[PDB]
Structures are given as structure tokens and as C-alpha cells.
Design a protein around this motif. Structure first.
Motif, PDB file in Angstrom:
ATOM      1  N   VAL A  85       0.825  -1.202   0.000  1.00  0.00           N
ATOM      2  CA  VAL A  85       0.000   0.000   0.000  1.00  0.00           C
ATOM      3  C   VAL A  85       0.863   1.258   0.000  1.00  0.00           C
ATOM      4  O   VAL A  85       1.754   1.409   0.839  1.00  0.00           O
ATOM      5  CB  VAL A  85      -0.981   0.006   1.186  1.00  0.00           C
ATOM      6  N   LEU A  86       0.595   2.167  -0.934  1.00  0.00           N
ATOM      7  CA  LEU A  86       1.331   3.419  -1.011  1.00  0.00           C
ATOM      8  C   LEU A  86       0.712   4.447  -0.081  1.00  0.00           C
ATOM      9  O   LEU A  86      -0.511   4.495   0.080  1.00  0.00           O
ATOM     10  CB  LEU A  86       1.299   3.991  -2.431  1.00  0.00           C
ATOM     11  N   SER A  87       1.565   5.277   0.510  1.00  0.00           N
ATOM     12  CA  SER A  87       1.077   6.403   1.287  1.00  0.00           C
ATOM     13  C   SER A  87       0.548   7.486   0.351  1.00  0.00           C
ATOM     14  O   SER A  87       0.805   7.488  -0.857  1.00  0.00           O
ATOM     15  CB  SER A  87       2.214   7.002   2.109  1.00  0.00           C
ATOM     16  N   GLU A  88      -0.204   8.431   0.920  1.00  0.00           N
ATOM     17  CA  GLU A  88      -0.665   9.570   0.141  1.00  0.00           C
ATOM     18  C   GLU A  88       0.515  10.332  -0.458  1.00  0.00           C
ATOM     19  O   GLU A  88       0.469  10.775  -1.613  1.00  0.00           O
ATOM     20  CB  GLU A  88      -1.523  10.474   1.026  1.00  0.00           C
ATOM     21  N   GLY A  89       1.593  10.490   0.312  1.00  0.00           N
ATOM     22  CA  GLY A  89       2.767  11.166  -0.216  1.00  0.00           C
ATOM     23  C   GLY A  89       3.375  10.444  -1.406  1.00  0.00           C
ATOM     24  O   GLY A  89       3.786  11.074  -2.387  1.00  0.00           O
ATOM     25  N   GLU A  90       3.415   9.115  -1.344  1.00  0.00           N
ATOM     26  CA  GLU A  90       3.922   8.334  -2.468  1.00  0.00           C
ATOM     27  C   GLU A  90       3.030   8.477  -3.698  1.00  0.00           C
ATOM     28  O   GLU A  90       3.526   8.693  -4.811  1.00  0.00           O
ATOM     29  CB  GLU A  90       4.086   6.879  -2.045  1.00  0.00           C
ATOM     30  N   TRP A  91       1.708   8.410  -3.518  1.00  0.00           N
ATOM     31  CA  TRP A  91       0.816   8.628  -4.653  1.00  0.00           C
ATOM     32  C   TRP A  91       1.021  10.003  -5.256  1.00  0.00           C
ATOM     33  O   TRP A  91       0.958  10.155  -6.476  1.00  0.00           O
ATOM     34  CB  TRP A  91      -0.661   8.443  -4.274  1.00  0.00           C
ATOM     35  N   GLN A  92       1.239  11.031  -4.425  1.00  0.00           N
ATOM     36  CA  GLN A  92       1.444  12.370  -4.967  1.00  0.00           C
ATOM     37  C   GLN A  92       2.657  12.412  -5.888  1.00  0.00           C
ATOM     38  O   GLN A  92       2.618  13.035  -6.955  1.00  0.00           O
ATOM     39  CB  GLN A  92       1.608  13.374  -3.830  1.00  0.00           C
ATOM     40  N   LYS A 114      -6.472   5.856  -9.895  1.00  0.00           N
ATOM     41  CA  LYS A 114      -7.309   5.238  -8.883  1.00  0.00           C
ATOM     42  C   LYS A 114      -6.583   5.030  -7.566  1.00  0.00           C
ATOM     43  O   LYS A 114      -7.228   4.633  -6.593  1.00  0.00           O
ATOM     44  CB  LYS A 114      -7.799   3.860  -9.334  1.00  0.00           C
ATOM     45  N   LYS A 115      -5.267   5.240  -7.514  1.00  0.00           N
ATOM     46  CA  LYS A 115      -4.509   5.143  -6.271  1.00  0.00           C
ATOM     47  C   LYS A 115      -4.781   3.818  -5.559  1.00  0.00           C
ATOM     48  O   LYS A 115      -5.034   3.761  -4.349  1.00  0.00           O
ATOM     49  CB  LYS A 115      -4.749   6.363  -5.371  1.00  0.00           C
ATOM     50  N   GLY A 116      -4.732   2.727  -6.328  1.00  0.00           N
ATOM     51  CA  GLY A 116      -4.888   1.399  -5.789  1.00  0.00           C
ATOM     52  C   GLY A 116      -6.291   0.838  -5.880  1.00  0.00           C
ATOM     53  O   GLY A 116      -6.462  -0.385  -5.782  1.00  0.00           O
ATOM     54  N   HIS A 117      -7.293   1.687  -6.084  1.00  0.00           N
ATOM     55  CA  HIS A 117      -8.687   1.238  -6.175  1.00  0.00           C
ATOM     56  C   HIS A 117      -9.053   0.920  -7.624  1.00  0.00           C
ATOM     57  O   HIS A 117      -9.959   1.511  -8.216  1.00  0.00           O
ATOM     58  CB  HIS A 117      -9.613   2.305  -5.604  1.00  0.00           C
ATOM     59  N   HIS A 118      -8.325  -0.043  -8.193  1.00  0.00           N
ATOM     60  CA  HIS A 118      -8.300  -0.271  -9.633  1.00  0.00           C
ATOM     61  C   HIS A 118      -8.880  -1.627 -10.034  1.00  0.00           C
ATOM     62  O   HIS A 118      -8.622  -2.096 -11.146  1.00  0.00           O
ATOM     63  CB  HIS A 118      -6.875  -0.105 -10.176  1.00  0.00           C
ATOM     64  N   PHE A 159      11.597  13.295 -10.970  1.00  0.00           N
ATOM     65  CA  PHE A 159      11.774  11.858 -10.891  1.00  0.00           C
ATOM     66  C   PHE A 159      13.096  11.535 -10.214  1.00  0.00           C
ATOM     67  O   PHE A 159      13.867  10.701 -10.680  1.00  0.00           O
ATOM     68  CB  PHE A 159      11.629  11.194 -12.260  1.00  0.00           C
ATOM     69  N   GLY A 160      13.364  12.211  -9.098  1.00  0.00           N
ATOM     70  CA  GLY A 160      14.433  11.825  -8.199  1.00  0.00           C
ATOM     71  C   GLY A 160      14.109  10.521  -7.509  1.00  0.00           C
ATOM     72  O   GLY A 160      13.080   9.882  -7.747  1.00  0.00           O
ATOM     73  N   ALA A 161      15.019  10.119  -6.617  1.00  0.00           N
ATOM     74  CA  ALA A 161      14.945   8.788  -6.019  1.00  0.00           C
ATOM     75  C   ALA A 161      13.624   8.564  -5.295  1.00  0.00           C
ATOM     76  O   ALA A 161      13.063   7.464  -5.355  1.00  0.00           O
ATOM     77  CB  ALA A 161      16.126   8.562  -5.067  1.00  0.00           C
ATOM     78  N   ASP A 162      13.119   9.587  -4.599  1.00  0.00           N
ATOM     79  CA  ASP A 162      11.836   9.462  -3.913  1.00  0.00           C
ATOM     80  C   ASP A 162      10.719   9.068  -4.879  1.00  0.00           C
ATOM     81  O   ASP A 162       9.968   8.120  -4.627  1.00  0.00           O
ATOM     82  CB  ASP A 162      11.516  10.737  -3.112  1.00  0.00           C
ATOM     83  N   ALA A 163      10.615   9.772  -5.999  1.00  0.00           N
ATOM     84  CA  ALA A 163       9.581   9.472  -6.979  1.00  0.00           C
ATOM     85  C   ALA A 163       9.842   8.166  -7.713  1.00  0.00           C
ATOM     86  O   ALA A 163       8.893   7.452  -8.046  1.00  0.00           O
ATOM     87  CB  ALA A 163       9.458  10.636  -7.969  1.00  0.00           C
ATOM     88  N   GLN A 164      11.115   7.828  -7.962  1.00  0.00           N
ATOM     89  CA  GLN A 164      11.442   6.531  -8.545  1.00  0.00           C
ATOM     90  C   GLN A 164      10.957   5.404  -7.656  1.00  0.00           C
ATOM     91  O   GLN A 164      10.361   4.430  -8.134  1.00  0.00           O
ATOM     92  CB  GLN A 164      12.951   6.406  -8.711  1.00  0.00           C
ATOM     93  N   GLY A 165      11.222   5.507  -6.360  1.00  0.00           N
ATOM     94  CA  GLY A 165      10.764   4.469  -5.459  1.00  0.00           C
ATOM     95  C   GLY A 165       9.249   4.388  -5.406  1.00  0.00           C
ATOM     96  O   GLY A 165       8.682   3.294  -5.360  1.00  0.00           O
ATOM     97  N   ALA A 166       8.575   5.539  -5.407  1.00  0.00           N
ATOM     98  CA  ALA A 166       7.121   5.529  -5.336  1.00  0.00           C
ATOM     99  C   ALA A 166       6.521   4.932  -6.606  1.00  0.00           C
ATOM    100  O   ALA A 166       5.572   4.138  -6.542  1.00  0.00           O
ATOM    101  CB  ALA A 166       6.614   6.950  -5.110  1.00  0.00           C
ATOM    102  N   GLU A 205       4.571  -2.128  -8.907  1.00  0.00           N
ATOM    103  CA  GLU A 205       4.550  -3.415  -8.217  1.00  0.00           C
ATOM    104  C   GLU A 205       3.151  -3.764  -7.737  1.00  0.00           C
ATOM    105  O   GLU A 205       2.734  -4.934  -7.812  1.00  0.00           O
ATOM    106  CB  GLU A 205       5.505  -3.366  -7.033  1.00  0.00           C
ATOM    107  N   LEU A 206       2.418  -2.782  -7.220  1.00  0.00           N
ATOM    108  CA  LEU A 206       1.053  -3.040  -6.775  1.00  0.00           C
ATOM    109  C   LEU A 206       0.178  -3.500  -7.939  1.00  0.00           C
ATOM    110  O   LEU A 206      -0.581  -4.473  -7.823  1.00  0.00           O
ATOM    111  CB  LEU A 206       0.493  -1.772  -6.136  1.00  0.00           C
ATOM    112  N   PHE A 207       0.300  -2.824  -9.083  1.00  0.00           N
ATOM    113  CA  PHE A 207      -0.374  -3.251 -10.300  1.00  0.00           C
ATOM    114  C   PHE A 207      -0.031  -4.697 -10.637  1.00  0.00           C
ATOM    115  O   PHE A 207      -0.921  -5.511 -10.911  1.00  0.00           O
ATOM    116  CB  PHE A 207       0.029  -2.275 -11.419  1.00  0.00           C
TER     117      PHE A 207
END
Length: 151
Positions: free
Chosen positions: A1-8, A78-82, A123-130, A136-138
């Protein structure tokens, strides 16, 4: 599950992609087909292409890249609600096109590579990881449907 910050972070870079869907789709499919030629062989529409220049000149390839990235963007937003988005996709890709889950990992790598080339400041490391977590969730959710269907 991604956090809201990760989805952003995911959707912030994705909004940059949607400024040039077709060009991103070309870069991604070409990277995929060059890095993993077994993926190209799954497309009757494209397996005649034998060079990168031929791939870049194919309008039909560009059209399909738009189809792929449009479907993926609808999933990500959909932020996971897919669940509804994945049902027809898993059905066709498991039973008709016969696409191993591993190939989804390959295109995920091509997506991350192209986004890093085109949008480094977003698309720095934070966004790459997110983005890796979102893809991966997909894959996890597609894989569960594949297993249900015996593929």
C-alpha cells in the motif's frame, strides 16, 4: 500500500507524461522491445519491425503506445482502487495475448527508465521508489487474477 505522499509523487510525474502521451509511449515500447525482444514477438502487429528506426517510424506502434499509457494512467489515478480496470486487462493478457507476469516487470523497468530520462527534476529517487511501488502493486494484483485463471 502506497502512502498519500507516495501517490502524490507518482501522479505528479504522470501529469508530465500526459503532456506528450504518444512520445512517451514510443520511447517506452521501443526500450522494451530492444531490451527484451521476446516481448516484441508477442505482437503480430509489430514483430515485422527489425530496427529502432523502423520502430520510431511506425505510426501503428505510436498508436498502441497511447492505448497502453492511457490505460495505465487511468489505473494509477485510482490510487490502488483499480479492481474494475484490471479485470478486462488480466483476462485478455492472460488468456488471449498470453503475457507472462515477468513481461509486466520488463515494461515497468522501461517506464521508470523513460520517466527518469524525460523528467529528472520530478523523478528523483523518492519518486522513482514511489513509481516502482505503484507498478509493483499493479503487478501484484494482475498476478492474483492470473493465478485464479490458471495462467
Amino acid at each position: 500500500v502506497l502512502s498519500e505522499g507516495e501517490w502524490q509523487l507518482v501522479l505528479h510525474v504522470w501529469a508530465k507524461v500526459e503532456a506528450d502521451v504518444a512520445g512517451h509511449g514510443q520511447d517506452i515500447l521501443i526500450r522494451l522491445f530492444k531490451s527484451h525482444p521476446e516481448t516484441l514477438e508477442k505482437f503480430d502487429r509489430f514483430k515485422h519491425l527489425k530496427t529502432e528506426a523502423e520502430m520510431k517510424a511506425s505510426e501503428d506502434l505510436k498508436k498502441h503506445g497511447v492505448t497502453v499509457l492511457t490505460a495505465l494512467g487511468a489505473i494509477l489515478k485510482k490510487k490502488g482502487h483499480h479492481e474494475a480496470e484490471l479485470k478486462p486487462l488480466a483476462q485478455s493478457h492472460a488468456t488471449k495475448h498470453k503475457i507472462p507476469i515477468k513481461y509486466l516487470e520488463f515494461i515497468s523497468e522501461a517506464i521508470i527508465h523513460v520517466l527518469h530520462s524525460r523528467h529528472p527534476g520530478d523523478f528523483g529517487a523518492d519518486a522513482q521508489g514511489a513509481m516502482n511501488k505503484a507498478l509493483e502493486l499493479f503487478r501484484k494484483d494482475i498476478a492474483a487474477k492470473y493465478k485464479e485463471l490458471g495462467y
